[PDB]
Amino acid sequence: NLPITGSMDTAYANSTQEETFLTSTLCLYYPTEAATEINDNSWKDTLSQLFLTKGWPTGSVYFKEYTDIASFSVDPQLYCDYNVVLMKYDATLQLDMSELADLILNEWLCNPMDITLYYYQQTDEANKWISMGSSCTIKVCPLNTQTLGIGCLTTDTATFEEVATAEKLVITDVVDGVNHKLDVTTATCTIRNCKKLGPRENVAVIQVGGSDVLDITADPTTAPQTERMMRINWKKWWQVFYTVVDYVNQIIQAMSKRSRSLNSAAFYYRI
Amino acid sequence: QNYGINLPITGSMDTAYANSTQEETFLTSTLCLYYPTEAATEINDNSWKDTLSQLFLTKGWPTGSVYFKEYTDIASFSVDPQLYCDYNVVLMKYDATLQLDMSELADLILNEWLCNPMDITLYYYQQTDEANKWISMGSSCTIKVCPLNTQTLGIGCLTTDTATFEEVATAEKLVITDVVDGVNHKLDVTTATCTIRNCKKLGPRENVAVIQVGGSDVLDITADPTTAPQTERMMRINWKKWWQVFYTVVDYVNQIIQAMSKRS
Amino acid sequence: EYIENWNLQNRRQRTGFTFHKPNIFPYSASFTLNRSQPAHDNLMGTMWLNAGSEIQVAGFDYSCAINAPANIQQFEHIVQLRRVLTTATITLLPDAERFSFPRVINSADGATTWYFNPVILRPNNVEVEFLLNGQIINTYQARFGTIIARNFDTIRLSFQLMRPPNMTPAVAALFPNAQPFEHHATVGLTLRIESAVCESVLADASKTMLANVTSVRQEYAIPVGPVFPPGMNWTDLITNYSPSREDNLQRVFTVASIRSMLV
Amino acid sequence: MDVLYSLSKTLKDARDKIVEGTLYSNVSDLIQQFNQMIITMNGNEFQTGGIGNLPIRNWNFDFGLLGTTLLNLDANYVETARNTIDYFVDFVDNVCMDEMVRESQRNGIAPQSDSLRKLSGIKFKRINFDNSSEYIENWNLQNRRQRTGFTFHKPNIFPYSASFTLNRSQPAHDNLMGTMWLNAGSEIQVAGFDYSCAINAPANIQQFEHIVQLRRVLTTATITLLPDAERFSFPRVINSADGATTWYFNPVILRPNNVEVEFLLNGQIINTYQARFGTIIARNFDTIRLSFQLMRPPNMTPAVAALFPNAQPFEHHATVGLTLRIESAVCESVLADASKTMLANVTSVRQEYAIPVGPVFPPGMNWTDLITNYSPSREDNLQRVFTVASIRSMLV
């Protein structure tokens, strides 16, 4: 990182929207019921041709399908330069969808949490415990300097306080500066000590139907709706895809290139 | 003053404020309340329109000007809703299952539209820009579309076979269709029961205020996903009785009118 | 200087008065709306303060020139100086700090108040024209800081709101494709005449002739006469600066300088 | 230059003092000086003009002397004097214009027009008398290699520069730390902005620095320092440094903390003021260093606490501004300022006659370019043309 000095008299460059569309890829994530209702085996081709009418080259818009919010939340691997997740709304899953958004709208620096040998804690408000798997049931036993438990016995898990049950993804936030013994099913879950670095600008979440319920910040005093969190009312999925295609320029203007240099080596759909 | 986009109007930042014009506008303006049949059902009083007119008179309106129009429900009210009052207030009952229909109705009545007739049998139709929409109304509106290419052949559809078309509306009473711009579309609609119009959203409708009774903020009067604006004419209240809803509308009628602009 | 100009004017020779910050513009805080409607929510126009030796103008578009051709909204402002200025040093600054904060402004006829919520953008294609008798004398394109207007009686400021073709998400949010518009794109301009030369007498920031004459007239309760406005108010005087007013005012200014030699 | 100035001063004194009815005792010395000027100039041929659209003009001096026997001046005497005065004023105006439009790189202090070079001859020094104006006095001091001094009300020392430096930036430009400034004329507005309000800063303090280099040394400078920057306190959409994109700025103004202004000369601290606002005196400096701090308020009201969250998004960006206005200063070099007119006169003459761009000054006499690259050669040429412009302003 170096200082950048700019002149406020500098002339605006021409639109780069065409070039970024030509040199980037767009990944769309939708629920399988969308494909069920559309009932057309060539609809990927149709959406690709419509996106070509919108500027994107053929073969740059990738369509990815997930069963539901709960399943998609197990290690979501976002591939393209720009990712748009069409997330169905359910009044019963307000937390989970939020968690999913909280997982994909932010960058996370995660390290393994070997609970069975080590005692863990959360240093600051950015530190969370992100647990993903088939069934994440997490119980917590707060501890203290004398190494005893507060309303929990380290030798008896039945006394561990309950914070997650049968979860595909859950973010656990406990009181900072306190050591907690953890009881989670390592067989059906993996828990990681994570820090949210900041917003993840290459991922937009469009909530299909419903109202504003997403809360991507653990702080109760903030429920910020960034430009990348859209929400559309719906009755047909074809209308949903038509609006995603038509306002694609608007959607991408709300997004920015990831810019984060990762330690990982994952697969990407890139040109 | 009117709508002088054509010609300039110059003003001085020292011009003294006139007095309140609220009384004069109430005296020269007709007020209409659009409420669902359920409201009249829960209000067993038959002379209740008279009482509401009297209460408005206590609030300044002359006793020939406040009007009350009933509609069965949102679906039926969305069929060619005619608003002929200087100030229109639509009390719109909220239902979680009809969110898109609430949004379509509010978009239709909270905005001005320039609509031209459509002939889905005689011509193909495309949408020019983000303002060009298709607005279909009637008893039942089932609309299917086949996007064409530059060669007029269909994309993921066959023009001859309507079954291969893509379905954007079923049995609707009102629907706003927004397709990808610049692409000719062959259309199939139930013209017997569905009139479709090629419409352009000119701008907000300033004399119509929708009070959403109960519920939350679900109205999305913009086809752009990135924007869900809440204009000052889109109000929301929490309710258990319709008499209290009407009393709230009457008592804060000054606040409701100052949130709207008189008919031009 | 004043007696020299008096003698020169008696002989019909070219006079010259050097003014630091001449009070050449009568106070006028006004606005023009080129696009408007009774709700005052999608407004395009200009608002300006001409005061003394300062012009502060600002062109505002509520739609941010979304529908304007080429995404450019052209704003123009004209100030007709009541006397010709020569050898004028003028500061240009891109922004108008006076029209960059939210304000509630009366309607042209005073019936209602409208709302202004500026978000300031760099003025584009800035063009200052200094004209004399309807002919262009000096032209400055995209020039800021000190400029020289050698001889002019009219200032024509043409500027543009150019919608930025690229926007970051925070920026892209503020300017939606359609109404409602909550952040109105404003382009400013500030013009400051620091020093000029005029063949006529004027008030300015460094002298005391006007203040001396006004003080003497107020101290002895001089009734209003048929030449000068009541109280020797400079705005009225310069607004209707007639040759008869110019002669009387030069006389009293010369006498005031002669008095200042001693008092 | 001194001879041209003396001609102009003699002509101005003659205009002001040779008036109807005045005692000859009032003008006797002036009459002697005027007749001496006639004697010196008589029989001398000059040519002005011939550059740009400035017309070639030929000047011939064959004049009679003024009478000396009157007790009081009458109308006849004044008209007789005025004819010669008019011709001489025309000549001096044309010489001044011919000099104002010319420049040289190596020897720009020396006269450039043929007429002024001829007037630099020894025989013309008889015209020379009282050199009392500030510009001619500084010209004579510079010729004698003495310390020079020009007083400027609001010196135009800072070239126009509206720029920003981002010390923390992202492609989405939403967690931005840096500063933006306008230097223009005698004004410097600076504003440091932190989008996170220094929540992650070590001691909740963000340090901002702004160094401005003056192209000439200023002395005896009265400056006003104010703790806010109105220029960077309203929302704006600003281009990016490359111009590719635009970012958003939504200031909320906090008072600057630990304000420290240093006036430096050759990198040495001459004057220093901490937490001092209003009028300060910088006695001798060439650099201004403004250091200020954004201190996160330890205690906040609910509205203030709502403005500044723990993490992103950041919608209200904390800003601390400083304003520095030089009202009066002294410089050893000529500078444009707000009260004088020499620059405007030189530019006006160069424009009215369509003078081609020369090898010294920037096109159009643009002050920003001149002061940005204020080289010694440019300073010499500028002092020459400014002295000539003042001499011209004595008459025209």
Ligand SMILES: *[C@@H]1O[C@H](CO)[C@@H](O)[C@H](O)[C@H]1NC(C)=O
């Ligand atoms: C920018 O757009 C203009 C307008 O057509 C075009 O002439 C120009 O070549 C484009 N590119 C650049 C780099 O200016």
Ligand SMILES: *[C@@H]1O[C@H](CO)[C@@H](O)[C@H](O)[C@H]1NC(C)=O
């Ligand atoms: C406005 O109100 C004032 C204050 O009572 C009253 O005197 C006046 O007549 C009213 N009407 C007008 C036109 O000013």
Ligand SMILES: [Ca+2]
């Ligand atoms: Ca969960």
Ligand SMILES: [Ca+2]
């Ligand atoms: Ca327990």
Ligand SMILES: [Ca+2]
């Ligand atoms: Ca915690």
Ligand SMILES: [Ca+2]
């Ligand atoms: Ca929260």
Ligand SMILES: [Ca+2]
């Ligand atoms: Ca519908």
Ligand SMILES: [Ca+2]
């Ligand atoms: Ca098909």
Ligand SMILES: [Ca+2]
């Ligand atoms: Ca469309």
Ligand SMILES: [Ca+2]
């Ligand atoms: Ca929308």
Ligand SMILES: [Cl-]
């Ligand atoms: Cl000043």
Ligand SMILES: [Zn+2]
């Ligand atoms: Zn108006």
Ligand SMILES: [Zn+2]
């Ligand atoms: Zn001053």
Ligand SMILES: [Zn+2]
């Ligand atoms: Zn940048």
